[PDB]
Every structure is written in C-alpha cells, then in structure tokens.
Amino acid sequence: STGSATTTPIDSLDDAYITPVQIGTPAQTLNLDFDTGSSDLWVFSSETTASEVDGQTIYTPSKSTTAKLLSGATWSISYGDGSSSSGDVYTDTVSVGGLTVTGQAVESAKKVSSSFTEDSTIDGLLGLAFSTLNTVSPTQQKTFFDNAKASLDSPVFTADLGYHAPGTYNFGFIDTTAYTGSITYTAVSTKQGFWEWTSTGYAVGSGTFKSTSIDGIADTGTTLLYLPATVVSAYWAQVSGAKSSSSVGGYVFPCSATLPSFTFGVGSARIVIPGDYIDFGPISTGSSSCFGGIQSSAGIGINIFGDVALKAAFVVFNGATTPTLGFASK
C-alpha cells in the first residue's frame, strides 16, 4: 500500500504545517501537525477541557463505531517549546492520504497547554519519530508509520515541505518526480528515539564550505533551524545590524536586510536554504526588527534541522531495519 497527503502551512510564515487525517467510522477529519520529532498521535477531543478548546476540530470517539477505549492507558507529553498535553487513549481506524491503519492508538487530550489552545489551526499531532518515545503508559504504543510499515510497498515516508506553499507527505514510495538530481543517504542513530544524523558542514552565502560534523535531528515539528552558537554567529555576522536579543529570545535583524543563503552538508552533497526562507518577519506587528530563522541550539541540548532546513529539500525517512535519512534538492 501507499498513501499521499498534502500538507499546508498554517500561516504566512510557515510556522507549522497541517495535514488532514481521517479518524474513526464514519470518518472524522482532523488537521494534524506531522512531527518527526515526537511519537504520539494525539487529538483535541470531546474529552478536552472546554475552556482549552478555541476553534479546533475535535475527535468524538462516541460517534465512531470502530473506537475502543484502551482501558487504563494514559499519556502525557511535554515538547521542547514548553508546551504540553495529556489524556487517555482509544484505538481506532486512522487513514492518511488513502493509507489506512486499523487499531491505531489515538491519544485523546483531556488537557492542553495554552499554546495549543491559542492555535485554532492545529487539531493535534501525528508523531513520526521512533515508537520508543511514545508516552502511553503502562503499555507503550506504536506510531502510525510503525503500524503501517509492514503493509507499505517500501518501509519509507517522505517529507516535501513547501516554502509559503503546500507540500506533500508520502508513505510507502519515493516520488522520483518530486526532486532534482540524486538522493544522498546518511546514517541515522535511533539511540535518542529521533531521526538523528550528522551533517558534514555548512556555508554562509557564497562563502567557502566549512567541513565540520554537526549532529542533529530531522524534525518537521520544529519551525526553525537550531545550530551551534559558532555556526549561527558566523551566519548572522553576514547581515548588517543583526544581533542576538535576550529580550526577544534570539537573533533579530533589520527587516530592510537581504539575507544570505545557508548551505548544509549531507555527505558530499549540499542543500541550499535560500535567504528568504530565513526571514520570519517582524517580531511584533509593525516592527522593523525581524526574527531570524536560524537560531542557536545552545539552550536546547540538541541541534534541530527543523522546517527552515527541511523545506529546502526532499527528505526520505527510511524505516528499513537499519534506518537512514535521504536528502535531495528540489
């Protein structure tokens, strides 16, 4: 089998992407944030505290003839941005882009933190990291990809995120029309449960490429590119007037600037992020200070190849027995 679904930016800055997902019988379609940095499929639901729902579409398990309470199971997750959610668990039929999994754990939120409530466009998350990170207790649950893998034509999914435009998540096949040149594959460590790999270096604009190993994760659920402070300083030093602002929480730059590109290495290959992808706009409405899309990872503990980086490539998440990542230009 295969599946193919369109993913759409939630706003004009590509702050996140939503993909429609059919849950239950008859189908209830919710727009979920596909997140290769976590491993829980959770939804706003009829069980969510009413004051914490503000415009989201909810899953109502009592209206699904295929929903079954997973008795005793609970979940609770906290994300790298400080947001969180928790609740109980049903199994139900879940379909993405024509690909159907029966018996998928659907984690029903009883509580969500303010950032989720405040984003009316995201009805939940669909985790695509390794199932070892799933938070369901006492019986850990598998991701949608893990459950679908055996049925897929090839044990892969691909992320093709758009810049200010829709893109595609495919399951089970590699669309050879969706990229240019060849796909370069690189080794993955699953020891932290992430799609963790080592980039071979970077360049700033037309500058020379610096060969240096940068361990990080391919994370579709993170907006920006988080890299070591040395790398980030070298980038922003090429932008007149750019500075790191403690009050804002990262590098800002004059909105009048033209940003240089940023290149990262995948083996001997190179992915170029155009400068425009690094502009996240005024820090507040009407400000002439703009927020940068490359930020320091120093306060995180891991480097994160988020959407800013991933949207510049066609990315293969290869879930073969030995997983690997593939990157192509497009």
From Swiss-Prot:
Catalytic activity: Hydrolysis of proteins with specificity similar to that of pepsin A, prefers hydrophobic residues at P1 and P1', but does not cleave 14-Ala-|-Leu-15 in the B chain of insulin or Z-Glu-Tyr. Clots milk
EC number assigned by the record: 3.4.23.22
Enzyme class: hydrolase
Cystine residue pairs: 255-290
Keyword rRNA-binding in record: no
Domain Peptidase A1 residue range list: 17-328
GO BP, sorted A to Z: proteolysis
Keywords: Aspartyl protease, Disulfide bond, Hydrolase, Protease, Signal, Zymogen
Active site: 35, 199
Molecular function, one GO term: aspartic-type endopeptidase activity
Keyword Transcription regulation tagged: no
Family that this chain belongs to: Belongs to the peptidase A1 family.
Name used for this protein in its record: Endothiapepsin
Native source organism of the sequence: Cryphonectria parasitica
Residue window of the full protein shown: 90 to 419 of 419
